[PDB]
Design a protein that fits this description.
Chain A: This is Outer-membrane lipoprotein LolB. The complex is a heterodimer of chains A (180) and B (185). Chain A is α+β, with helices and mostly antiparallel strands. Chain A has three helices and eleven strands. Chain A is 16% helix and 47% strand. Chain A has an eleven-stranded antiparallel sheet, covered by helices on one side. Helix content of chain B is 8%, strand content 49%. The chains are: A alpha+beta (180), B mainly beta (185). At the A-B interface, strand 1, strand 2, strand 4 and strand 11 of A face strand 5 and strand 12 of B.
Chain lengths: 180, 185
C-alpha cells in the first residue's frame, strides 16, 4: 500500500468514528431466493441509535424501524396490525416484512467501516487504499462506487452490495448528511 | 360542489395521460422527498407511473400483474394485481362507480389550496385516508396519509383525454441483466 494512501484511509476512518451522528437517503433492493422488494430509505444514526424509514412505491405505505446497536433490540411501526418489537431488530423486521437486512451491522458497513468488538474482518483494498470488499459477521460487503469527497465530507460509499448466502442487499446512497 | 367535478372529469373517460409532481412532507409540512414524471391510466385496471426526476423508476399495472422496476438497482418486483383501488384510487377514476364501493366518500365543505376536495375514507383494507382535489381543469391534486403520519401530495398537469396509447404503455419489458423477484411477505 502507498504511504499517502495509508494515511488517507486512517484519517477517513478516524474522522468518521469521531462523528457518530449522521444520516443518509437512498434506494434499496432486497432479495432472498426468488422474492424480495425495493423502496426509498432514510437512515438516521445517533451513535448506536438508528431511525430507519422505508417508503414503499405503489402501496405508498412507509414503515419506521428504530433500534440500538448496543442491545440489538428494535421496534417496527407503521404496518397493519400495529407495532412490533423484540430483542433482535433484524428478526423483528424479518418476521414482519420478509425482508432480510442486517440492521445492527449497517451503521458501520454503509460507511465502509468494520464493526468494533465483532471478530476480525477480512478487508480488501482498491487501488487507492479504500475498502473494496469487507467480510465480517457472515456477510460479504462490496463497495462498488464512492461519493465524491469535499473539504467537509470524507469519501463515503455510493453503491454497496451485501450478501449472506442467498440473502442479497443492494443499496444506492443518494445523499449523505454529516456533522460539521 | 366537488362531486360535480369528478363526474364532469371522468365523464366518458376511457384513458388518461398527463404529468405529475410529488412532494412527501412531514407533520409540519417540510418537504422530505420531491420527484416528478408521467402518469397514464386506461380502463379498466391499467396504469403506469413513470418517475423521471431525480431518478427513474417505473411502476406498471398491466391488468394482471403489478411491476415495480428500478433501473439503477437492476431489479423489478412483480406481484399479481389484486384490488389496486385501495393502493391508488387514481384507477377508481376511469371507473367512477368503484369509488363509493371501497371508500366512504365524503365531500369537504371548505375549499383548500384553491380546490374542491373529496375525502376518501377507507372501508376496505393501503393508507389511512386519501383526498382528491378538483380545480378548473379537473383533478389537480391527490393526497394520502399513512399510519406514521407521512403525507404524499401529488399534483397533476397536462391531462390528455382518451389518448391513443402505444401498445406497450401498460406492459413491462425486461432489460438484460435485470433481477426479477416476487413480492416478499
Amino acid at each position: 500500500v502507498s504511504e499517502s494512501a495509508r494515511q488517507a484511509e486512517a484519517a477517513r476512518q478516524a474522522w468518521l468514528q469521531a462523528h457518530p451522528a449522521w444520516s443518509f437517503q437512498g434506494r434499496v433492493a432486497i432479495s432472498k431466493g426468488r422474492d424480495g422488494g425495493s423502496g426509498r430509505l432514510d437512515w438516521q444514526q445517533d451513535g448506536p441509535r438508528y431511525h430507519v424509514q422505508l417508503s414503499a412505491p405503489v402501496t405508498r405505505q412507509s414503515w419506521v424501524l428504530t433500534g440500538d446497536t448496543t442491545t440489538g433490540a428494535g421496534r417496527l411501526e407503521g404496518l397493519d396490525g400495529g407495532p412490533r418489537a423484540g430483542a433482535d431488530a433484524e428478526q423483528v423486521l424479518l418476521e414482519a416484512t420478509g425482508w432480510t437486512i442486517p440492521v445492527n451491522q449497517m451503521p458501520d458497513w454503509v460507511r465502509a467501516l468494520r464493526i468494533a468488538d465483532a471478530g476480525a474482518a477480512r478487508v480488501d483494498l482498491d487501488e487507492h487504499g479504500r475498502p473494496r470488499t469487507v467480510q465480517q459477521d457472515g456477510w460479504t460487503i462490496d463497495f462498488l462506487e464512492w461519493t465524491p469527497a469535499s473539504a467537509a465530507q470524507p469519501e463515503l460509499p455510493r453503491r454497496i452490495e451485501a450478501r449472506n448466502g442467498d440473502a442479497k442487499v443492494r443499496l444506492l446512497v443518494d445523499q449523505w448528511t454529516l456533522s460539521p | 360542489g366537488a362531486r360535480q367535478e369528478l363526474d364532469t372529469f371522468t365523464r366518458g373517460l376511457k384513458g388518461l395521460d398527463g404529468q405529475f409532481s410529488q412532494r412527501v412532507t412531514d407533520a409540519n409540512g417540510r418537504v422530505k422527498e420531491n420527484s416528478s414524471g408521467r402518469v397514464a391510466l386506461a380502463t379498466p385496471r391499467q396504469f403506469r407511473w413513470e418517475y423521471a426526476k431525480p431518478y427513474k423508476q417505473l411502476i406498471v399495472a398491466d391488468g394482471k400483474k403489478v411491476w415495480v422496476f428500478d433501473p439503477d438497482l437492476e431489479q423489478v418486483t412483480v406481484r399479481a394485481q389484486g384490488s389496486e383501488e385501495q393502493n391508488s384510487p387514481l384507477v377508481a377514476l376511469i371507473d367512477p362507480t368503484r369509488l363509493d364501493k371501497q371508500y366512504d366518500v365524503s365531500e369537504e365543505a371548505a375549499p383548500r389550496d384553491g380546490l374542491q376536495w373529496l375525502s376518501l375514507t377507507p372501508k376496505v383494507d393501503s393508507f389511512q385516508m386519501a383526498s382528491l382535489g378538483f380545480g378548473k381543469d379537473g383533478l389537480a391534486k391527490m393526497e394520502v396519509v399513512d399510519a406514521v403520519g407521512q403525507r404524499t401530495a401529488i399534483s397533476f398537469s397536462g391531462w390528455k383525454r382518451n389518448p391513443a396509447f402505444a401498445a406497450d404503455t401498460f406492459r413491462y419489458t425486461p432489460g438484460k441483466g435485470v433481477d426479477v423477484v416476487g413480492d416478499a411477505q
